[PDB]
Design a protein around this ligand. Structure first.
Ligand code: CU1
Ligand code: CU1
Ligand code: ZN
Ligand code: ZN
Lengths: 153, 153
């Protein structure tokens, strides 16, 4: 496929639709959409390993990391395939997403199809924190909303 | 990879979890789980094309049909890749699913990862109905619950 989508939903007011499109097999991936119900400010944003929603967002597992790297920002050489940094909400709780990433993909080892997109309660420290946790999750906190990444076209 | 799962949710009481497992590259897929809240009897059960939940189960599109064949039963040579026949709910409206299928797959062009699993209101006539719709959707009717098929641990 060249186009997939994830509909984020959680126990709370956080919700949104995120689109992904990749025209070429080894080309970049455009990510866009909106999320509401968020507190003003930054929020972690990543693709998690499992597209398993049997237990809310917690069953999505850790960050998608097929290359067994350490957590990082989307622009850091060292990073999980699923690390998409942070999204920002405005005073009304809305965050407009517009990302372009070259690590995630819709085919091969880096394929995010069938995995989960998650938006966190707090900001992602991009893996620069003075603690081991920062190198695993970025200390972004709990998962407010998530959705399985499915084929849309 | 070899294990995927789908959490079925709808606007009504119908809900459940269905697991899929494919041990060998191109071998058969074991499908099992449980669904509750259904009326007693048969119920259409298919994999639909899109894992698009932007409009509930309606955005899932039609039955997954890469080979452009007509609708049928799982044992038929002529059928949609996504045609998994019917599931049977007991007197208490619980359908214990347990079947194997070698048409669907967790890899390749027949892969159902990132697509949608749907449970219907009525029974799938396996394409033996006396009308045109029968060879299209088996007349299974409305979509009671669905879920995008995602990668499981
Ligand atoms: Cu995350
Ligand atoms: Cu169906
Ligand atoms: Zn990470
Ligand atoms: Zn069909």
């Amino acid at each position: 496929a060249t186009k997939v989508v994830a509909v984020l939903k959680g126990d709370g007011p956080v919700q949104g639709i995120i689109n992904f499109e990749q025209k070429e097999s080894n080309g970049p991936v455009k990510v866009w959409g909106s999320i509401k119900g968020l507190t003003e400010g930054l929020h972690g944003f990543h693709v998690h390993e499992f597209g398993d929603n049997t237990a809310g967002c917690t069953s999505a597992g850790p960050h998608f990391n097929p290359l067994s790297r350490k957590h990082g920002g989307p622009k850091d050489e060292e990073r999980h395939v699923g690390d998409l940094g942070n999204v920002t909400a405005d005073k009304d709780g809305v965050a407009d997403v517009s990302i372009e990433d070259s690590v995630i993909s819709l085919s091969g080892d880096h394929s995010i199809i069938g995995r989960t997109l998650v938006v966190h309660e707090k900001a992602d420290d991009l893996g620069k924190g003075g603690n081991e946790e920062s190198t695993k999750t970025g200390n972004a906190g709990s998962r407010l909303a998530c959705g399985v990444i499915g084929i849309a076209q």
